[PDB]
Design a protein around this ligand. Sequence first.
Ligand SMILES: Nc1nc2c(ncn2[C@@H]2O[C@H](COP(=O)(O)OP(=O)(O)O)[C@@H](O)[C@H]2O)c(=O)[nH]1
Lengths: 53, 420
Amino acid sequence: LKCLDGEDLNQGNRRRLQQLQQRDWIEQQIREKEERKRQEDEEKKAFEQQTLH
Amino acid sequence: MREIVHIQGGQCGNQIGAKFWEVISDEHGIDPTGTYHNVYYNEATGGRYVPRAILMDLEPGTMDSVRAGPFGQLFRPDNFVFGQTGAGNNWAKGHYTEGAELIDSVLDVVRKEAEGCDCLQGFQITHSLGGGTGSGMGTLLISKVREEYPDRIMETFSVVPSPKVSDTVVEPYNATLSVHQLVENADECMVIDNEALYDICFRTLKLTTPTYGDLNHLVSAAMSGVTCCLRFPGQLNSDLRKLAVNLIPFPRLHFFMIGFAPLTSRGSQQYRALTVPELTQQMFDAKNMMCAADPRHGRYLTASALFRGRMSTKEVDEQMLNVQNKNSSYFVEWIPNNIKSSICDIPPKGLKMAVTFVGNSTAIQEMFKRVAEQFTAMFRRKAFLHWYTGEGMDEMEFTEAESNMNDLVSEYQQYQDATA
Ligand SMILES: Nc1nc2c(ncn2[C@@H]2O[C@H](COP(=O)(O)OP(=O)(O)O)[C@@H](O)[C@H]2O)c(=O)[nH]1
């Protein structure tokens, strides 16, 4: 009982690793969202061209 | 956000509006096809930019012209509400007879224009005061919409009659009627007059063949500069209301004067330097403004100056304070620092600095004295009245109208004498 591994010694590692993972996922989601938005805009432009014709 | 509905009207209104939308299309880089190559324009399919504006006249003439000239494709044909009977230089004809027959559709389209906005700030008008169509229709529209929209402000870029040689002979009647109307339901009667424009074009641009194109372009430049420090980034921003609050100490005292700077010929352009001292020299000279009231024969209740250009700031304020504390006689005393300033960050197309100088002065009392005098001389003989009574109107209004006119100047002169 002199030492209990139930305390978190490497809290810094947990924190930094979670930060990096969160940044990675945020980047992926930002990219896919921008892609979706641009696709929606191009579809709207397509309907614009159909109506003009 | 903070949009603006432009209301044309009358022949002068239509021409000046065509020129104004031309200047705006120039500044915002819009070619006359309608594409780009929200404060004024509305977006439409395919990136098209349709101007948020409405034209009107009891005659389809000037409408046909502006639809035939350049930038005639911009304005949508739903906003060309136009009657075909004509008004004909009779204010009553365009304010009591045909007013009730077209104002319905005009209010319909103006409502469909305002509700289509999100947060409207104010209105802005371009019309004359003598021509029946312009004065009558425009002031009736202003009455209706101001009794409709109470919180937002008005703006009447109104061309008063020239002093010496009129354009119409029954001008003073329509002038006094329109100025008794607009003094009650409008916040800025920014007056413009042609003879001062002629003097400018002969004295500060050397164009010896002054055509209405150039005069309209000049007033267009002034009109654009009025609000430029809003739709652009700014070191110290402004709007249509910061002016309106730094300008009128009392709601009746809301008849301004306008001035634009700098103005140079082609020859002078190479040599004349462009720094804020000479811009100030220009903007504070008598022969440089657009009003038939010598600013050196009155005073300034207040005067604001919208600058444009990436220039210094301390020198602006220093020159303002110098111009004030030097001619403290030519300014009024009981108010401190009667000169307000503002600065944007983008100069117009073709220059690097620009000053729109607007001023709530008390020199225009000469103009209103002249108009009232012409009214007396043409009324005390019942002249030209059998028209303004055959259209459902008794002389009473006129007298009381003129009566109100008197009170107006009766305040101006008064405040030019108080000292404390
Ligand atoms: N600065 C300027 N003023 C104009 C111009 N055209 C007309 N005006 C004035 O417009 C006034 C005529 O008013 P308006 O109602 O439009 O004429 P109407 O349609 O025949 O009744 C006249 O007093 C003209 O002086 C222009 O092109 N430039």
